[PDB]
RNA sequence: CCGGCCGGGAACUCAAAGGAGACUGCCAGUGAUAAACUGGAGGAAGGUGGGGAUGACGUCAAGUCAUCAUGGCCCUUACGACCAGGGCUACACACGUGCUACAAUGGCGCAUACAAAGAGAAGCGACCUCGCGAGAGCAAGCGGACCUCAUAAAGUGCGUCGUAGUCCGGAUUGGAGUCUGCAACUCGACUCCAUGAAGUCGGAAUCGCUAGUAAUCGUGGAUCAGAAUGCCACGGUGAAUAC
RNA sequence: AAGAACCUUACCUGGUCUUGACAUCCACGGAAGUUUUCAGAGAUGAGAAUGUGCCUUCGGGAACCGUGAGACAGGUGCUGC
């Protein structure tokens, strides 16, 4: 019932943080639904490469927000006690829900 | 003129990003401007300190800035006072609580920013451009890089017609995305004009 | 095995619950005759559904997901291949020979910068 | 009932939760959302979280 | 360079976001009639720079009127430079 | 079925003849069609007085046929007598609805004069 | 083409027109601001729109009410 | 509730992490016993499987002192700076680029299908009511695999038009709602109702394209208070021809 | 130019300059701000009401604001040969 949605611009940090939340729930010994991949947002930007005049010559950039949802079945007080700074990742933003 | 930027083309493959944080689209632009201002301040304050790379990580409560410096002692100061003052001013630029760490850069000539600003300072001091380029490539080959390319560009040796001279030692395989090439630029504000030095150092295939 | 839809073509993946029985296509719990029964090109996509020659004793319910109609038909066809492969593997040679086992990797090419389409280029003036 | 009256803008700090020893100012509350919107610092990360009085126990 | 244009942008943001956009919002929602006009006359009396339409989005570092990208906050040349230096997090070249 | 115009149905639609008359638009056509509710491609034999009176009352209720020459020549004539340039700019012949005149406007200007 | 919530006039032009009608002894009223719908009160007054450095004086009549003031002023010159 | 909606299940589509697979690996022939080429099995993919990013030393004193930075020069009670109005939108004309067509492989009507990629908080905005309509009022769900933009369009199945200047849509100031009200006059977009011009497939020339390509038909984005037929992406149907 | 109604925005009218729209100092005064009136096309002036909090080893310190001279600004000015 505890709902953690964890997102980052890099997928290795994403797998690390979801493994950490899975590890905390596994240490407390509760049933964990496996980490659900959620679809990646590909934000594409097309940017002219020349200061004055060019239209054909232009380069493309993508920001990719990888998304995971653990959807752990059971929260507990020991994980609440160990919750402080458990993610420890500047790359990942985590949103909690009840 | 027609070439890719090596850090950008290797940004997802080999070379790491300079700023690692997540902010939403509301705060992305304000964060990016704060990164630029923090980088600008500590660059201009610690240019004598041989700062090479500046890594700003925001855990979105705070800001953590790691400065990769060849000379750590001048940044740190005596008893941490200088780096504490830097942390305070970086805190008011960012608007959030701040942290600054110093990561030392061993093998200072092997770093691309440092060799470029060294050639720039010599060109400011009117040392010969050829002397600066040859010293750069020879010290890199002595320290053990597989290659180094140095480009000086513009108004060389106080000559009215601008020229571009490249001194190359070793291997700099830019097309290989596996290869780690550190590419950086510096700018010499000489009395006749601006001279741009662009350096590439190739260390290995990762 | 229950004969089901597999396979892919264009932007499609197939959902046909083909079964023993007389063959009449039903789409979204509605008749093909109601949907597009007398449609021209419904025949040129119905023949690929039968192209596997394994429809003759088989009733068909078709609600394939994704893509346009012909890509849906190609997905249905490829599914009837891979399911008949799962039924008996001796007909693999004849389906491979007739070209049904191949997934056509053809897909829409991306639009490119300085080009109006994937390959179409703007008109060039000599002067 | 302890703290049966609910006051908007009231500051409560949960020592058990990750929000302990963290100070924040709530400029905007989304009444139209019907969920209280605070940029709470969680795991040392400040992000806006929708919250309810039933959802989080008051300190 | 272009210092007057940057100061004018600071001026219209300051007049619009802080001084007004509550006064102007109330006058506008009055001016749409809900069952010569006073809301029209008061909206005339309020400064023209209080309109958020007056603000032109410019690059934060350079100040360019054209080329702005709102997620980045910078003009196209500066987002290219920050992209190649790695300042923009997660920006990698797209090659699909 | 001729009212204030030069056009009659001839085994064809009343609506095209009405909008062939100037001073009205096709909304009169659409509304007269909706009130009629029958196929108009049929013959114009037994053209009904009901059709004639509906067309007459509909044009009388809405903008009358032949006010178009009136509206153009009013804007022209009153601002030419006053001396204001609004009538003058519609006298010159170019599009003043905001349209480009740099290389287009051949409909207003006519065939090209080299 | 415009809002039916209200007719649009400039406040300064409205004050100067009501002052001109009330006084009854007026010269042409100079208005740089061209985007003003003429009211029925204006008829019988001379009002000067902005073009160049020159003077465009419009004496408003009964017909020219719903129109804006700038329609009667030409901003460009041609042959 | 015959809606996966709901228990359930994770079997499949799918999401997105890690792998496997394609290397002339095998077989034959040619070739020098070499490289390679030609066919053949296997395989989903076969010989850069398709596409993209990637642009060597240099070149043209090619473009940008108007993104920025920069040497020198000039102005500095003005070449700075502030506001209103205006021009950047004018027009005897002439080419470059795309759009709409000149109908019947097409219109027009009624009923019925089948997508992918994206965006969304001063934002996307369902439902309902009022409007012919653009829209208004009320207003749920949504910082997003959930809700919304957004019941794609070609495809049809039936009818009808069977020269029609056609729904092909041009044309001054109207009759309107929306945006911002500095504010839609010069200068917005939208069903606009304005009169239904020109064009009955375009001379000399010229351009793009070798397969999911040309053609055609729709959808989204960035910019943006509003304002694309451009630009950037997305899917659908889908050729012809290379001696 | 990935967005000319105004703004963007250089080119025509009214207002400004030794601190200029924009940074830094030296001096003096005032919290910063909010709300109004009149004239005017208006940043421009001429007036009114409330707020000297915040603090300084008070021999008073702030982000600030008003004014004055100088240093200084400012230029989308020229030369991409």
Coordinates of N, CA and C in Angstrom, one line a residue, chain A:
Chain A
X1 N 0.8 -1.2 0.0 CA 0.0 0.0 0.0 C 0.9 1.3 0.0
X2 N 2.1 1.1 0.5 CA 3.0 2.2 0.4 C 3.5 2.4 -1.0
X3 N 3.4 3.6 -1.5 CA 3.6 3.9 -2.9 C 4.8 4.8 -3.1
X4 N 5.9 4.3 -3.7 CA 7.1 5.1 -4.0 C 7.2 5.1 -5.5
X5 N 7.2 6.3 -6.0 CA 7.5 6.5 -7.4 C 8.9 7.2 -7.6
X6 N 9.8 6.5 -8.2 CA 11.2 7.0 -8.2 C 11.6 7.2 -9.7
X7 N 12.1 8.4 -9.9 CA 12.4 8.8 -11.3 C 13.8 9.4 -11.4
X8 N 14.5 9.2 -12.5 CA 15.8 9.9 -12.6 C 16.1 10.1 -14.1
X9 N 17.1 10.9 -14.4 CA 17.6 11.1 -15.7 C 18.6 10.0 -16.2
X10 N 18.9 9.1 -15.3 CA 19.9 8.0 -15.6 C 19.3 6.7 -15.0
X11 N 19.5 5.6 -15.8 CA 18.8 4.4 -15.5 C 19.6 3.5 -14.5
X12 N 20.9 3.7 -14.4 CA 21.7 3.0 -13.4 C 21.4 3.4 -12.0
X13 N 21.2 4.7 -11.8 CA 20.8 5.3 -10.5 C 19.4 4.8 -10.2
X14 N 18.6 4.7 -11.2 CA 17.2 4.2 -11.0 C 17.2 2.8 -10.5
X15 N 18.0 1.9 -11.1 CA 18.1 0.5 -10.6 C 18.7 0.4 -9.2
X16 N 19.7 1.3 -8.9 CA 20.3 1.3 -7.6 C 19.3 1.7 -6.5
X17 N 18.6 2.8 -6.8 CA 17.6 3.3 -5.8 C 16.5 2.3 -5.5
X18 N 16.0 1.7 -6.6 CA 14.9 0.7 -6.4 C 15.4 -0.5 -5.7
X19 N 16.6 -0.9 -6.0 CA 17.2 -2.0 -5.2 C 17.4 -1.7 -3.8
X20 N 17.7 -0.4 -3.5 CA 17.8 0.0 -2.1 C 16.5 -0.1 -1.3
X21 N 15.4 0.4 -2.0 CA 14.1 0.3 -1.3 C 13.6 -1.1 -1.1
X22 N 13.9 -1.9 -2.2 CA 13.6 -3.4 -2.1 C 14.4 -4.0 -1.0
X23 N 15.7 -3.6 -0.8 CA 16.5 -4.1 0.3 C 16.0 -3.7 1.7
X24 N 15.5 -2.5 1.8 CA 15.0 -2.1 3.1 C 13.7 -2.9 3.5
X25 N 12.8 -3.1 2.5 CA 11.6 -3.9 2.8 C 12.0 -5.4 3.0
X26 N 13.0 -5.9 2.3 CA 13.5 -7.2 2.5 C 14.1 -7.4 3.9
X27 N 14.8 -6.4 4.3 CA 15.4 -6.5 5.7 C 14.3 -6.5 6.7
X28 N 13.3 -5.7 6.6 CA 12.2 -5.8 7.6 C 11.4 -7.1 7.4
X29 N 11.5 -7.7 6.2 CA 10.8 -9.0 6.0 C 9.3 -8.8 5.7
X30 N 9.0 -8.2 4.6 CA 7.6 -8.0 4.2 C 7.5 -8.3 2.7
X31 N 6.2 -8.6 2.3 CA 6.0 -8.9 0.9 C 6.2 -7.7 0.0
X32 N 7.0 -7.9 -1.0 CA 7.3 -6.8 -2.0 C 6.9 -7.2 -3.4
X33 N 6.0 -6.4 -4.0 CA 5.8 -6.5 -5.4 C 7.1 -6.1 -6.1
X34 N 7.4 -6.7 -7.2 CA 8.6 -6.4 -7.9 C 8.5 -5.1 -8.6
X35 N 9.7 -4.5 -8.9 CA 9.8 -3.1 -9.4 C 9.2 -3.1 -10.8
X36 N 8.1 -2.3 -11.0 CA 7.4 -2.2 -12.2 C 8.1 -1.1 -13.0
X37 N 8.6 -1.3 -14.2 CA 9.1 -0.3 -15.1 C 7.9 0.5 -15.6
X38 N 8.0 1.8 -15.5 CA 7.0 2.7 -16.1 C 7.6 3.4 -17.3
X39 N 6.8 3.7 -18.3 CA 7.3 4.2 -19.6 C 8.1 5.5 -19.6
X40 N 9.2 5.5 -20.3 CA 10.2 6.5 -20.2 C 9.7 7.7 -21.0
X41 N 9.9 8.9 -20.5 CA 9.6 10.2 -21.2 C 10.8 10.6 -22.0
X42 N 10.7 10.7 -23.3 CA 11.7 11.1 -24.2 C 11.4 12.5 -24.6
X43 N 12.1 13.5 -24.0 CA 11.9 14.9 -24.3 C 12.9 15.3 -25.3
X44 N 12.6 15.6 -26.6 CA 13.5 15.8 -27.7 C 13.5 17.3 -28.0
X45 N 14.7 17.9 -28.2 CA 14.9 19.3 -28.5 C 15.8 19.4 -29.7
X46 N 15.3 20.3 -30.6 CA 16.0 20.5 -31.9 C 16.5 22.0 -31.9
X47 N 17.8 22.2 -32.0 CA 18.5 23.4 -31.7 C 19.5 23.8 -32.8
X48 N 19.3 25.0 -33.4 CA 20.2 25.4 -34.4 C 21.6 25.5 -33.9
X49 N 22.6 25.1 -34.8 CA 24.0 25.0 -34.3 C 24.8 26.2 -34.8
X50 N 24.2 27.2 -35.6 CA 24.9 28.3 -36.1 C 24.4 29.6 -35.5
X51 N 25.3 30.5 -35.3 CA 24.9 31.8 -34.7 C 24.1 32.7 -35.7
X52 N 24.5 32.8 -36.9 CA 23.7 33.6 -37.8 C 22.7 32.8 -38.7
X53 N 23.2 32.2 -39.8 CA 22.3 31.7 -40.8 C 22.5 30.2 -41.0
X54 N 21.6 29.4 -40.7 CA 21.5 28.0 -41.1 C 20.1 27.5 -40.7
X55 N 19.6 26.7 -41.6 CA 18.3 26.0 -41.2 C 18.5 24.5 -41.3
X56 N 19.2 24.0 -42.2 CA 19.3 22.6 -42.4 C 20.2 22.0 -41.4
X57 N 21.3 22.7 -41.0 CA 22.3 22.1 -40.0 C 21.8 22.4 -38.6
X58 N 21.5 21.4 -37.8 CA 20.8 21.5 -36.6 C 21.0 20.2 -35.8
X59 N 21.1 20.2 -34.5 CA 21.4 19.0 -33.8 C 20.3 18.8 -32.7
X60 N 20.1 17.5 -32.4 CA 19.0 17.0 -31.6 C 19.4 16.4 -30.3
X61 N 18.7 16.7 -29.2 CA 19.0 16.3 -27.9 C 17.8 15.7 -27.2
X62 N 18.1 14.7 -26.3 CA 17.0 14.0 -25.6 C 17.3 14.0 -24.1
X63 N 16.3 14.4 -23.3 CA 16.3 14.2 -21.9 C 15.4 13.0 -21.6
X64 N 15.8 12.0 -20.9 CA 15.1 10.7 -20.7 C 14.9 10.6 -19.2
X65 N 13.6 10.5 -18.8 CA 13.2 10.4 -17.4 C 12.7 8.9 -17.2
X66 N 13.6 8.1 -16.7 CA 13.2 6.7 -16.4 C 12.5 6.7 -15.1
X67 N 11.5 5.8 -15.0 CA 10.4 5.8 -14.0 C 10.3 4.4 -13.5
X68 N 10.2 4.2 -12.2 CA 9.9 2.9 -11.6 C 8.9 3.1 -10.5
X69 N 8.2 2.0 -10.2 CA 7.3 1.9 -9.1 C 7.5 0.6 -8.4
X70 N 7.9 0.6 -7.1 CA 8.0 -0.6 -6.4 C 6.7 -1.2 -6.0
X71 N 5.8 -0.3 -5.5 CA 4.5 -0.7 -4.9 C 4.6 -1.8 -3.9
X72 N 5.3 -1.5 -2.8 CA 5.5 -2.5 -1.7 C 4.2 -2.7 -1.0
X73 N 3.9 -3.9 -0.7 CA 2.6 -4.3 -0.1 C 2.5 -3.8 1.3
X74 N 3.5 -3.9 2.1 CA 3.5 -3.7 3.6 C 4.5 -2.7 4.0
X75 N 4.1 -1.5 4.5 CA 5.0 -0.6 5.2 C 5.2 -1.0 6.7
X76 N 6.3 -0.5 7.3 CA 6.5 -0.8 8.7 C 7.3 0.3 9.4
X77 N 7.2 0.3 10.7 CA 7.8 1.4 11.5 C 9.3 1.3 11.5
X78 N 9.9 0.1 11.4 CA 11.4 0.0 11.3 C 11.9 0.6 10.0
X79 N 11.2 0.4 8.9 CA 11.6 1.2 7.7 C 11.3 2.7 7.8
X80 N 10.3 3.0 8.6 CA 10.1 4.5 8.9 C 11.3 5.1 9.7
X81 N 11.8 4.3 10.6 CA 12.9 4.7 11.4 C 14.2 4.8 10.6
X82 N 14.4 3.8 9.7 CA 15.6 3.8 8.8 C 15.3 4.7 7.5
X83 N 14.2 5.3 7.4 CA 13.8 6.0 6.2 C 14.7 7.2 5.9
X84 N 15.2 7.8 7.0 CA 16.0 9.1 6.9 C 17.2 8.9 6.0
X85 N 17.3 9.6 4.9 CA 18.4 9.6 4.0 C 18.7 8.2 3.4
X86 N 17.7 7.4 3.2 CA 17.9 6.1 2.7 C 18.3 6.0 1.2
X87 N 17.7 7.0 0.4 CA 18.0 7.0 -1.0 C 19.4 7.5 -1.3
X88 N 19.8 8.6 -0.7 CA 21.1 9.2 -0.8 C 21.6 9.4 -2.2
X89 N 20.7 9.8 -3.1 CA 21.1 9.9 -4.5 C 20.6 11.3 -5.0
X90 N 21.5 12.1 -5.5 CA 21.1 13.4 -6.1 C 20.5 13.1 -7.5
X91 N 20.8 12.0 -8.1 CA 20.3 11.7 -9.4 C 18.8 11.4 -9.4
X92 N 18.3 10.8 -8.4 CA 16.9 10.2 -8.3 C 16.1 11.2 -7.5
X93 N 14.9 11.5 -8.0 CA 13.8 12.1 -7.1 C 12.8 11.0 -6.8
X94 N 12.4 10.9 -5.5 CA 11.5 9.9 -5.0 C 10.3 10.7 -4.4
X95 N 9.1 10.2 -4.8 CA 7.9 10.7 -4.3 C 7.2 9.6 -3.5
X96 N 6.8 9.9 -2.2 CA 6.1 9.0 -1.4 C 4.6 9.2 -1.5
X97 N 3.8 8.1 -1.2 CA 2.4 8.2 -1.2 C 1.9 7.1 -0.3
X98 N 0.7 7.3 0.3 CA 0.2 6.4 1.3 C -0.8 5.4 0.7

